[PDB]
Amino acid sequence: QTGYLTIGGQRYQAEINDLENLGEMGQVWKMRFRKTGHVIAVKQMRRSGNKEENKRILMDLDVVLKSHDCPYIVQCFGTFITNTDVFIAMELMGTCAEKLKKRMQGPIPERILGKMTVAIVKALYYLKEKHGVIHRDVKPSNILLDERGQIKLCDFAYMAPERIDRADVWSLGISLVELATGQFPYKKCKTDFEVLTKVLQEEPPLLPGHMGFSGDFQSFVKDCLTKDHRKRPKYNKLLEHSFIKRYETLEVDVASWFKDVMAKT
Numbered sequence: 001q002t003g004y005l006t007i008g009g010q011r012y013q014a015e016i017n018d019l020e021n022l023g024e025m026g027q028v029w030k031m032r033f034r035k036t037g038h039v040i041a042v043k044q045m046r047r048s049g050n051k052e053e054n055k056r057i058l059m060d061l062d063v064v065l066k067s068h069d070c071p072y073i074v075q076c077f078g079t080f081i082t083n084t085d086v087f088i089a090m091e092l093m094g095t096c097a098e099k100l101k102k103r104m105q106g107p108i109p110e111r112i113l114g115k116m117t118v119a120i121v122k123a124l125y126y127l128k129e130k131h132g133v134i135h136r137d138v139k140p141s142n143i144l145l146d147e148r149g150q151i152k153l154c155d156f157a158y159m160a161p162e163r164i165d166r167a168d169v170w171s172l173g174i175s176l177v178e179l180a181t182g183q184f185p186y187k188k189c190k191t192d193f194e195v196l197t198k199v200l201q202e203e204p205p206l207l208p209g210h211m212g213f214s215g216d217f218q219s220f221v222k223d224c225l226t227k228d229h230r231k232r233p234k235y236n237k238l239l240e241h242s243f244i245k246r247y248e249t250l251e252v253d254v255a256s257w258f259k260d261v262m263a264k265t
């Protein structure tokens with residue numbers, strides 16, 4: 001559907017002029033619905049833009065509109081189609097995990113990465129089983145969080161060893177090591193090919209053992225960083241890992257932690 005906004009459970013007859021532009025975020029606009037006061041994220045696709053960009057934007061929007069039943073994927077509130085533009089209203093999140101790392105200026109606690117791991121794995125498992133989509137780029141910039149504790153996947157250096165000669169599991173492990181240590185494991189590489197050489201030649205950058213990380217966390221990262229892809233576990237096997245099982249039920253106040261980090265300059 002187009003020309004309608006669905007915030008919560010109320011559908012609103014809306015047009016693009018019913019939204020107030022509050023500025024650009026990081027092209028995704030922050031806009032306010034004048035009829036209710038809701039602030040939403042709006043992605044603008046110009047019909048005169050690049051054909052390559054508009055091709056993938058329409059492709060992911062197809063998946064986004066099909067992912068209304070997944071609580072770990074950014075939801076679409078509606079679309080506005082004009083004679084020159086396509087505005088995609090999206091659920092407004094707080095910030096991405098990469099900004100949280102830079103704002104923290106240090107490692108992100110394991111309990112936060114535990115809830116983050118459960119959310120991201122279930123999002124990737126949803127894209128594969130129900131949509132046949134394999135998200136070929138999982139990184140902290142694609143992991144979104146808000147002030148209510150939600151952790152969702154955004155869009156659809158981290159390439160798996162076999163993707164060069166499943167593959168997304170390797171990208172999640174690299175992201176977990178980067179957030180758990182505050183250091184990108186391939187930060188000393190100048191070119192993209194130098195990162196490539198170290199992934200195949202060097203041992204997997206595992207989690208350090210002197211930071212109080214639980215054995216379940218280090219085991220989950222080691223399983224994600226398996227160089228031989230034939231021995232890398234499935235999402236079916238990952239979802240039963242004790243690290244996933246712990247944070248599927250453990251109460252972690254991600255909302256309060258998110259506010260505390262955002263309250264720093």
Ligand SMILES: *CCC(=O)N1CCC[C@@H](n2nc(-c3cn(-c4ccc(C(C)=O)cc4)nn3)c3c(N)ncnc32)C1
Nearest residue numbers: 025026028041057060061074090091092093096098141
């Ligand atoms: C670290 C991440 C970061 O800084 N960002 C860049 C600036 C915008 C930030 N941000 N993105 C979203 C967002 C984007 N999408 C999205 C929807 C559809 C498609 C396609 C290709 O169809 C692509 C992206 N959904 N959500 C944000 C939201 N929703 N809230 C807050 N900030 C957001 C990411």
